[PDB]
Amino acid sequence: PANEVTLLDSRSVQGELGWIASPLEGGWEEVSIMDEKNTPIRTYQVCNVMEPSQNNWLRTDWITREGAQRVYIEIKFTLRDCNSLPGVMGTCKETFNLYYYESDNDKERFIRENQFVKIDTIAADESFTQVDIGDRIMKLNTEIRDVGPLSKKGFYLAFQDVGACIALVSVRVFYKKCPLTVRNLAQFPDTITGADTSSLVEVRGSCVNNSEEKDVPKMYCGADGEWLVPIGNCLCNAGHEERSGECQACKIGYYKALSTDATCAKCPPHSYSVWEGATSCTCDRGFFRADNDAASMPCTRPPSAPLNLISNVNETSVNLEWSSPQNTGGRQDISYNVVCKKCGAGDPSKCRPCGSGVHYTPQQNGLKTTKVSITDLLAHTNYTFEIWAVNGVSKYNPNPDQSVSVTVTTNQAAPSSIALVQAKEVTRYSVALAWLEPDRPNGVILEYEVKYYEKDQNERSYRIVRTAARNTDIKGLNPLTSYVFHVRARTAAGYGDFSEPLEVTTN
């Protein structure tokens, strides 16, 4: 019934025990009496209390060790009180000797009576049957004796009667074992106990298949048959959680990239759910993640092109200006790449790329600044520049669908000053404005800028409005105040000039 592995038992025997008794006749007898319920046992009895001198031997069959160090013997026996039975004192006894002999031979024909090693003279503890004459009651005394260390293949057991009235009910032969337990995520196997009751066995158990040994896992096997407090911890591998005592896989929609004490984290925003036991949640179509980027980070989108572009030309150099992009995607690392196309010269789409050594003062490509300057260009030639918005993920992601570009000419002059300005609708709150296009545009007109500053009063902040149309108005202005306006023409070529200083006083 106990966790201890049994070697020899009176109940477990196939039919008869078949034990050698010396002497055969007038010695130990195989008198079998049935025990409740339906259990057949071979009971050994001897009662030669009357005869003066008594010597008895009962040798058991071959008992294999099976890799055991210390064996525990449990004997169940019934006795008789020498005073309760008629006869001379001393002739009757209340004690019996126990013997053991180590051997390597499987089927030994005979074992010497002198070669046996004595263990202890056993008496019925605590109480013993007399037996009571009025009513008959069964005994409850079971005696245990230990034997070790053992060197040979196996052993034989013997019993010696010195003139007592004894009945051996059951003989239990077992060896104390440490159970197979999985503690601190590491597996520990079943182990045998030491040579002594004080002895302990150091058991270094291997970790689970889906785990890695961070610390050496070890335990001590106690002689009683129980495992001791663990030394060293084991942690489950990446993509496997430390739950239920055995390495489990991450659920559908969960991941683990590093072998940490924490459980499988849920997929980051915009990340596609992978199968059971995932290292990192994969990025779905349209969203991606960089190689040098952390696994915890969400799937980032590529950047949009910068919406506004401003260009200014010099005698041999050109200047480009732009703002921040609309959709960052998530990543903060945004750099700008300037690409020379040379497609401006000529009407067809087919063109030759800028092969000549084009020099750039801030940076060639991957510029973190919002402004760029091209040092050298060829005169009388039409060029076209593409400002590419580059992300840290844009390389891993597909090449951006669009990039804001502007076609500019090096030799062409900036637009001239505007001829005249006229106010069409003047009121106490609003002042309308209308103007003509400059006499010399030197390129297609793209934008107009109007200045707004206070006259006959302290130098205020000159407000500049941007309008593609040649007509504009103002909302929210103080009455009875003088204002001066200047219209400036802006083309692809560059910066224009201020207009006629129109003094308009509010109604």
């Binding site: 009662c47 006795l79 009945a167």
Partner: protein, 136 residues
């Protein structure tokens, strides 16, 4: 020294009713259950529960509050021939429940059928222990 008794209705000694055996001190008694071959469909098969009763239980064939349960002939298809039960006629018994025997006294044994007799007549055995004067 040893006494062999075959417990079955087919036996001519049991049919008489006055079946008795004279035994001595430290003698053995072997009771054999009715053994049947595998060809038997277990219908004609005999099965008995043995009891150790007194003089009142011997004549009336009753075991309730008169005797104690001894042996049972449950499985007739035993591997090593018939079922054998040993009984030693010892003066003193080392076992707590083990039955003792006195010289110059009578001991009785009865058997009841498992499927039945109907309390009419039972297979009985009379056991007499010869005194110390008769035994050597």
């Amino acid at each position: 020294d040893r006494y062999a008794v075959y417990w079955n209705s087919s036996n001519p000694r049991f049919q008489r009713g006055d079946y008795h055996i004279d035994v001595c001190i430290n003698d053995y008694l072997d009771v054999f259950c009715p053994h049947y071959e595998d060809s038997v469909p277990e219908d004609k098969t005999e099965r008995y529960v043995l009891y150790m009763v007194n003089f009142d239980g011997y004549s009336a064939c009753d075991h309730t509050s008169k005797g104690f349960k001894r042996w049972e002939c449950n499985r007739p298809h035993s591997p090593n021939g018939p079922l054998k039960f040993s009984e030693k006629f010892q003066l003193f018994t080392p076992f707590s429940l083990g039955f003792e025997f006195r010289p110059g006294r009578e001991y009785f044994y009865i058997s009841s059928a498992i499927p039945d007799n109907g309390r009419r007549s039972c297979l009985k055995l009379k056991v007499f222990v010869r005194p110390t004067n008769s035994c050597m």
